[PDB]
Design an enzyme around this catalytic site. Structure first.
Site, PDB file in Angstrom:
ATOM      1  CG  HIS A 171      -1.372   1.414   1.543  1.00 43.95           C
ATOM      2  ND1 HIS A 171      -2.448   2.028   0.817  1.00 43.95           N
ATOM      3  CD2 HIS A 171      -1.377   2.243   2.554  1.00 43.95           C
ATOM      4  CE1 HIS A 171      -2.809   3.035   1.283  1.00 43.95           C
ATOM      5  NE2 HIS A 171      -2.215   3.134   2.490  1.00 43.95           N
ATOM      6  CG  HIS A 176       0.542   6.558   0.509  1.00 44.55           C
ATOM      7  ND1 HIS A 176      -0.465   7.506   0.622  1.00 44.55           N
ATOM      8  CD2 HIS A 176       0.060   5.544   1.252  1.00 44.55           C
ATOM      9  CE1 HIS A 176      -1.362   7.212   1.395  1.00 44.55           C
ATOM     10  NE2 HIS A 176      -1.087   5.976   1.939  1.00 44.55           N
ATOM     11  CD  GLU A 216      -4.912   6.306   3.210  1.00 45.47           C
ATOM     12  OE1 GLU A 216      -4.642   7.148   4.216  1.00 45.47           O
ATOM     13  OE2 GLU A 216      -4.012   5.747   2.626  1.00 45.47           O
ATOM     14  CB  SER A 235      -2.396  -0.301  -2.323  1.00 43.98           C
ATOM     15  OG  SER A 235      -3.246   0.087  -1.232  1.00 43.98           O
TER      16      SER A 235
HETATM   17  C1  LIG Z   1      -9.200  -0.785  13.137  1.00 37.25           C
HETATM   18  O1  LIG Z   1      -8.206   0.150  12.792  1.00 37.25           O
HETATM   19  C2  LIG Z   1      -8.890   1.326  12.985  1.00 37.25           C
HETATM   20  C3  LIG Z   1      -9.534   1.822  14.046  1.00 37.25           C
HETATM   21  C4  LIG Z   1      -9.683   3.387  13.928  1.00 37.25           C
HETATM   22  C5  LIG Z   1      -9.216   4.057  13.017  1.00 37.25           C
HETATM   23  C6  LIG Z   1      -8.266   3.777  11.955  1.00 37.25           C
HETATM   24  O2  LIG Z   1      -7.949   4.536  11.126  1.00 37.25           O
HETATM   25  C7  LIG Z   1      -6.860   5.399  11.312  1.00 37.25           C
HETATM   26  C8  LIG Z   1      -6.237   5.376  12.582  1.00 37.25           C
HETATM   27  C9  LIG Z   1      -5.195   6.241  12.634  1.00 37.25           C
HETATM   28  C10 LIG Z   1      -4.893   7.087  11.669  1.00 37.25           C
HETATM   29  C11 LIG Z   1      -5.659   7.232  10.531  1.00 37.25           C
HETATM   30  N1  LIG Z   1      -5.178   8.351   9.630  1.00 37.25           N
HETATM   31  C12 LIG Z   1      -3.900   8.399   9.036  1.00 37.25           C
HETATM   32  C13 LIG Z   1      -3.438   9.329   7.964  1.00 37.25           C
HETATM   33  C14 LIG Z   1      -4.296  10.713   8.323  1.00 37.25           C
HETATM   34  C15 LIG Z   1      -5.748  10.480   8.236  1.00 37.25           C
HETATM   35  C16 LIG Z   1      -6.243   9.355   9.619  1.00 37.25           C
HETATM   36  C17 LIG Z   1      -6.515   6.243  10.229  1.00 37.25           C
HETATM   37  C18 LIG Z   1      -7.459   6.310   8.940  1.00 37.25           C
HETATM   38  N2  LIG Z   1      -7.112   5.145   8.107  1.00 37.25           N
HETATM   39  C19 LIG Z   1      -6.061   5.505   7.030  1.00 37.25           C
HETATM   40  N3  LIG Z   1      -5.789   6.778   6.955  1.00 37.25           N
HETATM   41  N4  LIG Z   1      -6.033   4.457   6.276  1.00 37.25           N
HETATM   42  C20 LIG Z   1      -6.511   3.129   6.263  1.00 37.25           C
HETATM   43  O3  LIG Z   1      -7.287   2.866   7.272  1.00 37.25           O
HETATM   44  C21 LIG Z   1      -6.204   2.245   5.465  1.00 37.25           C
HETATM   45  C22 LIG Z   1      -5.473   2.547   4.429  1.00 37.25           C
HETATM   46  C23 LIG Z   1      -5.052   1.504   3.087  1.00 37.25           C
HETATM   47  C24 LIG Z   1      -5.649   0.162   3.642  1.00 37.25           C
HETATM   48  C25 LIG Z   1      -4.944  -1.019   2.529  1.00 37.25           C
HETATM   49  C26 LIG Z   1      -5.966  -1.045   1.290  1.00 37.25           C
HETATM   50  N5  LIG Z   1      -7.193  -1.226   1.857  1.00 37.25           N
HETATM   51  C27 LIG Z   1      -5.527  -2.109   0.443  1.00 37.25           C
HETATM   52  O4  LIG Z   1      -6.169  -3.304   0.322  1.00 37.25           O
HETATM   53  O5  LIG Z   1      -4.702  -1.963  -0.217  1.00 37.25           O
HETATM   54  C28 LIG Z   1      -6.111  -0.156   4.803  1.00 37.25           C
HETATM   55  C29 LIG Z   1      -6.274   0.823   5.711  1.00 37.25           C
HETATM   56  C30 LIG Z   1      -8.222   2.173  11.931  1.00 37.25           C
HETATM   57 FE   LIG Z   2      -2.109   5.096   3.390  1.00 39.12          FE
END
Ligand SMILES: COc1cccc(Oc2cccc(N3CCCCC3)c2CNC(=N)NC(=O)c2ccc(C[C@H](N)C(=O)O)cc2)c1
Ligand SMILES: [Fe+3]
Length: 292
Positions: A171, A176, A216, A235
């Site tokens: 990913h 990115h 994202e 990804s």
């Molecule tokens: C259970 O886990 C939790 C629980 C609560 C919240 C949570 O999300 C969070 C937690 C902390 C920070 C953030 N940000 C970080 C950047 C700034 C914005 C907020 C986020 C928000 N998430 C993301 N930014 N991204 C993803 O979640 C993501 C992306 C790609 C793939 C891979 C893709 N599906 C593939 O197959 O290639 C998977 C997941 C996760």
């Molecule tokens: Fe990401």
């Protein structure tokens, strides 16, 4: 007692947030994606310790990937490259060849974070540091203020190459990195981070949701047609197709509205936002950050 939260004041200060990793069974109420696979779990500990031990100024440790990890990469890389020409935005396609030439993007080779970091430093001044998993929105965005992108180094579990509910290095590298190599996008991303630094909890949440629905999971308009620029789409073989299938709702990107939309974790999104271009999303974000 209301105080301004600590924020990094220089690039090396990210040493004091990069190890604040949200953990399953603690901050994250969810199952680890290969929890019951003892071999996967052991391997994931190896990657976590490499990230936790890293300090600003170190070369990023080079990893000998297993045959299985390389195969998962190859499956993901091969099938996504069959989709990119019809699904990916123009800026993405422009940069992908350069990474193949300079950073070893191939079916049989997982690019090393150190090489990609050096490439990004030359192109846009972006750099990478390895990270063990998710950080808080505040911490992750704080890195972007210094053009540092925190990157996972492990590979998703082989039981589903087509979509993973957790970020992995496929990913980071395919979602990115190619757009971090584009100056307008690098500027867009830094400006989200700059706006976040020392901001209120509410301002951080809103900036994070705007990031989520652009960097994202964003779609953009190019020559009267929707194309993909969100890293989480680029990804996932299965969500990339979904985003352009017509099965999902779309709305215009509009920060004051977009910032209220729920960010979905562990499924396809219910809604994608469409930006006109990187410059326009950047301009809209500039107008919005004045208000928060
Ligand atoms: C259970 O886990 C939790 C629980 C609560 C919240 C949570 O999300 C969070 C937690 C902390 C920070 C953030 N940000 C970080 C950047 C700034 C914005 C907020 C986020 C928000 N998430 C993301 N930014 N991204 C993803 O979640 C993501 C992306 C790609 C793939 C891979 C893709 N599906 C593939 O197959 O290639 C998977 C997941 C996760
Ligand atoms: Fe990401």
């Amino acid at each position: 007692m209301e105080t301004v939260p600590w924020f990094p004041k220089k690039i090396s200060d990210l040493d004091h947030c990069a190890n604040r990793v949200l953990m399953y069974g603690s901050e994250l109420d969810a199952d680890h994606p290969g929890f019951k696979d003892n071999v996967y779990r052991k391997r994931r500990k190896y990657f976590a310790d490499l990230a936790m031990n890293y300090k600003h100024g170190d070369p990023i440790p080079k990893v000998e990937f297993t045959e299985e990890e390389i195969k998962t990469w190859g499956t993901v890389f091969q099938e996504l490259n069959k989709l990119y020409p019809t699904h990916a935005c123009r800026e993405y396609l422009k940069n992908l060849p350069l990474l193949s030439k300079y950073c070893g993007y191939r079916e049989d080779n997982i690019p090393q974070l150190e090489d990609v970091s050096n490439f990004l430093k030359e192109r846009t001044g972006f750099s990478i540091r390895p990270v063990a998993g998710y950080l808080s929105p505040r911490d992750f965005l704080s890195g972007l203020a210094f053009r540092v992108f925190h990157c996972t180094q492990y590979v998703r579990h082989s039981s589903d190459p087509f979509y993973t509910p957790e970020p992995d290095t496929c990913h980071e590298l395919l979602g990115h990195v190619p757009l971090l190599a584009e100056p307008s996008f690098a500027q867009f991303s830094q400006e989200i981070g700059l706006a976040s630094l020392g901001a209120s909890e509410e301002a951080v949440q809103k900036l994070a949701t705007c990031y989520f629905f652009t960097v994202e999971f964003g779609l953009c308009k190019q020559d009267g047609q929707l194309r993909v620029f969100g890293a989480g789409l680029l990804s996932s073989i299965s969500e990339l197709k979904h985003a352009l299938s017509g099965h999902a709702k779309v709305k215009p990107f509009d920060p004051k509205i977009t910032c209220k939309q729920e960010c979905l974790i562990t499924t396809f999104q219910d809604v994608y936002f469409v930006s006109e271009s990187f410059e326009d999303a950047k301009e809209k974000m500039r107008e919005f950050t004045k208000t928060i």
